[PDB]
Design a protein around this ligand. Structure first.
Ligand code: HEM
Length: 182
């Protein structure tokens, strides 16, 4: 993934646990060589997955909790590190934002030519609920999506109830979530 993602993970961990713990994780992940992540540079997805695993070990938390934390963190990080206006342009409510998300990533992709973005499709089941279809070229990022949805819930001061109803990994087509919001 692009360096920006790895910087965001480093930032979250540093801000929450200290540069010492971060350095420990970085070392364990096998990334001691890398002096710093270059935000607009493409990296192997391996870097990101290794960071998360190593962090799960050092911190003694399941990796899923780390993807969730990171998903939540991302909503704030992007808004503060150069993508606040983009985020705003995607709307002022959860359902509208989720409808705009493919278009938001298309806009990101204008600048990150090698982007492999997620795809999100909403099937609205009422004015306060939807079924969200998440399609990805990558494995294991459902928990990150859960965190991101909570982050957007905070962004929009909206209560978000999310349950995963289908799983990419256990041989279903793609991840699906049922969501209620108020
Ligand atoms: C705030 C709501 C957002 C959500 C819910 C979201 C969702 C996601 C998810 C789930 C992924 C994982 C990649 C995959 O599934 O294959 C991803 C990747 C990514 N997103 Fe978004 N995103 C959001 C906002 C943004 C914004 C504002 C930016 C601006 C830079 C951004 C840039 C990226 C980048 C660079 C990747 C890495 C993909 C790659 O490097 O190929 N995202 N996003």
């Amino acid at each position: 993934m692009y360096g920006l993602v790895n910087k965001a993970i480093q930032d979250m961990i540093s801000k929450h646990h200290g540069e010492d713990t971060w350095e420990a994780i970085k070392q364990k992940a096998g990334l001691e060589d890398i002096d710093f992540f270059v935000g607009m540079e493409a990296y192997s997805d391996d870097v990101t997955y290794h960071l998360v695993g190593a962090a799960s070990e050092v911190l003694g938390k399941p990796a899923e909790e780390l993807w969730i934390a990171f998903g939540e963190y991302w909503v704030t990080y992007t808004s503060e590190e150069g993508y606040g206006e983009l985020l705003a342009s995607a709307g002022d409510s959860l359902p509208e934002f989720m409808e705009n998300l493919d278009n938001l990533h298309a806009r990101v992709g204008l600048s990150f030519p090698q982007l492999r973005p997620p795809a999100f499709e909403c099937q609205h089941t009422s004015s306060k609920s939807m079924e969200l279809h998440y399609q990805s070229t990558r494995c294991g990022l459902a928990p990150m999506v859960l965190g991101l949805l909570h982050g957007l819930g905070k962004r929009f001061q909206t209560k978000v109830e999310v349950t995963q109803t289908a799983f990419r990994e256990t041989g279903e087509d793609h991840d699906i979530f049922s969501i209620k919001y108020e």
